[PDB]
Amino acid sequence: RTGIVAGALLPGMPHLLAEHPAPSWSALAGAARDVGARLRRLEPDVVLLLSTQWFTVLGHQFQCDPNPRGEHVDENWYAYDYGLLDYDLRFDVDFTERWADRVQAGGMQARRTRYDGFPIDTGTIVTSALLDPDRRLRWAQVSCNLYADADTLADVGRAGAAAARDAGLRAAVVVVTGMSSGLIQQWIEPGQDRIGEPGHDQWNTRVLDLLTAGKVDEVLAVREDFARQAQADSQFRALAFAAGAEATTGPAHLHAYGPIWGTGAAVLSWNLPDH
Amino acid sequence: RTGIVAGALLPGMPHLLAEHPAPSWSALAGAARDVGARLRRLEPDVVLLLSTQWFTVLGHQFQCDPNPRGEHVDENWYAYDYGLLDYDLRFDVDFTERWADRVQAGGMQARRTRYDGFPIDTGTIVTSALLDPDRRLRWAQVSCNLYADADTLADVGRAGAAAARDAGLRAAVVVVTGMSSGLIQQWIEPGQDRIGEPGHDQWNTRVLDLLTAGKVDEVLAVREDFARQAQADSQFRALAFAAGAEATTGPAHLHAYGPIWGTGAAVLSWNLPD
Amino acid sequence: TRPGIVAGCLSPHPPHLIYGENPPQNEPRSTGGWETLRWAYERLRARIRDVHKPDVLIVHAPHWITMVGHHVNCVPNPRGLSVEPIFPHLFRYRYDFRTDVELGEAIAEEASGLGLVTRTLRDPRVRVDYATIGALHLANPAWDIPVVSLSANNNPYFYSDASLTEMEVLGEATRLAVEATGRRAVLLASNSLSHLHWHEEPELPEDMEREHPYNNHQYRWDMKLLEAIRRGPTAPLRDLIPEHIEATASETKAGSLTWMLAAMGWPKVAGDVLGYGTIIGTGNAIVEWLPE
Amino acid sequence: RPGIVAGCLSPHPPHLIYGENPPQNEPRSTGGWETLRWAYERLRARIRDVHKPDVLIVHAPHWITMVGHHVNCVPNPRGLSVEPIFPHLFRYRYDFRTDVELGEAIAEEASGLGLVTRTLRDPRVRVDYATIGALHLANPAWDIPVVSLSANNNPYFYSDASLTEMEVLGEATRLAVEATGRRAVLLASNSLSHLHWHEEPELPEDMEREHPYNNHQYRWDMKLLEAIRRGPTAPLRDLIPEHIEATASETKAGSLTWMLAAMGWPKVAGDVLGYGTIIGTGNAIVEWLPEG
Ligand SMILES: [Fe+2]
Ligand SMILES: [Fe+2]
């Protein structure tokens, strides 16, 4: 089959790679690694990618450096072992060109990004380490515009799925996002993690129940509520992008759910069986 | 017959009212009074008016004060008897409103002007004194925009003629403008007045010949050359306004031509007999 | 030396600046606007009031266009109502100030002695022009400093670039008079820079979303002139002013800037650009020059 | 006399560095935003020639620390700072020295006052583009020790920073400056109204396309600035949140509050060195001095 054929959603905080992880971090990390094995078994030509931690407020930026690599010390977690992250990413910059072109054809400002020293976000590095330790996948990444409407990001998602079809690619979509963002303002130990604020846990589970039942358009109808009351990562526009990219079809398989330093975190997949 | 039925062009410099004028100033002044008597005989309901000395650079301003009056001392000729000027002007502000609405409907910025102390330009004051000493005419006046194209003023004139016809008015058009503007930059005596620069006198007579021959178009075609080479008052856009108002039809009658402190000046009329 | 002219200023006069301030003398009222330029003028006001402390403000502005030579307002106490004919909704200013008649008479005398065609205006019935009033209000809204208002030689029927050479003569005439009479004077050259503007006024005049450079070409040329003002001496401005006029239709074509710099002796100094901003698209800079 | 000798509102949009074409910045411009850059030149001279501080303490919004307030105690931060949203405008090679002792004292005082804090000592962490931009604009010679403070906020759900915690951090900063005998200048690097173009003009520095986002944002900026240039700073305590609610001001990051709190809310006016817009956002350069 051509086009977008699989989808996955996973958290992106570096705690998933901790040497001494909280039980929830190791469960989320293990689920992510499982999703990665399934994704690589699908053998997609390209994986469209959006991580909330590469954000923008001006147009839609696309990663056009074919091979960013190096070491990244996260600006927040430098003091922990999981704050030091190595990365070596391969981007299909030519499919990215087709996708950026489709976005410009839709009236949006597509911005090619190829600069030495351009910052690489922690979410993308963590996702590569969990889903693709051997760097087999070829990514196509767009920024997460926080300024324009969430539906414009859905439009960019629709443009990506159309480009994948025009290019004859077997592609998947991966979005790196948290759920509720109730961060614990303390230097906690791994054993004392928890959902951070009242009502956040119920909100995450409500959203997760709807997605596991294939009721995606109903999470999108309540997205703004989820964002306001549970401080969902980037107003959960990562889901709007994934839905736009035809990636969230059918029932969602919940692989794991738990807290990361107060935030809500879940590993989900669409159309990613074990076989 | 309704609409614009007559037209006239006269100079606006206060030298026409001098107690001790050069022969040219007096001839032009008498020519202006002549046109005035012909105009008032025509008994127009309203006279559309453009004076180069009420200029603007922003939209098109319309005189909406029904009765400006007072005494005005010209900022240039205050030292001479003709620098002191009294005026009492009556504007038909309701027709002016219709005219302004038509200009606004045409996509142009029509700006209604009614303010205490608004300056009244010397050209309009001199014109009223010569054409209408008993203040019996009712004027409708628009500014002379110098910044927009000259053809936008032709559109304003066309709108004024259309408004006069719609209102059923018998109207005339008067434009107050100099010709060449090669002013003598010296405090001369009346007897030594002369066209200021070379080519200005020849350029003036050239357009007058065409106008008297009813060739207003060929004047408009060379208007920019006239403006550049003879420094025609406001690029002679006052003629573009009158032509747009359909007031310059048929042969022009040349009542007088002569210099005023170096500039060229002429009194002309269209369809004003007797 | 310690010249009589203790400072010379480029002091633009667009009525929008007075309108935005809502001074008591101005009938129309705004909701603000052009704040940064008004704040810059407040800085210049304090420089005149608190530092220069001049005996007289000598102003040259373009709109009193006198078609025969140069005129000097020698009316002892000019008063009246000044209505901006193009922006009457913005500027209807009731003025009342005192003239340094002796200095005005000396300036005209020195000017005629240098070969300029001159005249002294003595008729109090003549209305002071809206640009002179605007410039003076912005430089000193207290009106508690004697004034000498100078007119602008130009053609009111075919406006052209003023003879900049003649304005240098008027500057020397002004310098000679200030020195001869022992006056301590601040000069006000009231010209804007790039002078292409909107053909249509926004519905709210002070809607600052609609206030920006006419185009980047006009802006870049203003910047070229201002950067030269901020670094090198003033004498090179003699050659740059005409080029900037040809490129932008600058109001400096009136010659007021040239007049002031020449009156200061083309001092080998930089100009302090207190502020720059646009007014209906035109470039406007408030600048202070000091003696060497 | 207080150890903090001046506090500044010092916005950091990359356009201002881009327009200056400094050697450290890789991209090259044809200019732009000149009036704001000239205002910064004025601030630079004030810092260099008058205040003469032992250290520059900077708080900026883009080093977002999700847990508490961090202090950069890296002795010699170096690296390449690429602005992710405007990488065509700002790719800055930086190298400066940290006043480690002061930074450690600030962290110690802040924790003593009840804030969650951390001291960064890993030189591999890249300094954020806003901190670099602010420091360049205040002192492009980089010859004054620095203490860089992070901005407590949520990077996954950006919100109005806790202005109360910022007041605490400000007191912590004052205590540390006094305890260590330092003479400091503070840099609160926030823009004002923060709604901006969603499309960049073809030429970034096309100043025709530079103007307020809308008049509502402009007038609210003017209301804040008028209060700044007139009354004491204590009323700003309530005006700042009000202005944030109406304009989405970048002061919601809390840096302005932090600095004013560090200065003890002095009963003084702020000197507005300049205001202008950058892609529609309001940007003011302001200097506050201690009472007396
Ligand atoms: Fe002017
Ligand atoms: Fe910022």
Residue numbers in the entry:
A (entry chain A): 4 to 278
B (entry chain C): 4 to 277
C (entry chain D): 30 to 321
D (entry chain B): 31 to 322
Text of the article:
We have discovered a new cluster of genes that is found exclusively in the Actinobacteria phylum. This locus includes genes for the 2-aminophenol meta-cleavage pathway and the shell proteins of a bacterial microcompartment (BMC) and has been named aromatics (ARO) for its putative role in the breakdown of aromatic compounds. In contrast, the 2-AP ring cleavage is catalyzed by 2-AP 1,6-dioxygenase (AmnAB), which oxidizes substrates with an amino group adjacent to a hydroxyl group. First, based on the co-occurence of a putative 2-AP 1,6-dioxygenase, which is suggested to catalyze the benzene ring cleavage of 2-AP (herein referred to as ARO dioxygenase), with shell proteins, the ARO BMC is the first metabolosome predicted to be involved in the degradation of aromatic substrates. Our results show the ability of recombinant ARO dioxygenase to interact with either catechol or 2-AP substrates and convert them into aldehyde intermediates, which are then detoxified by the ARO AldDh.
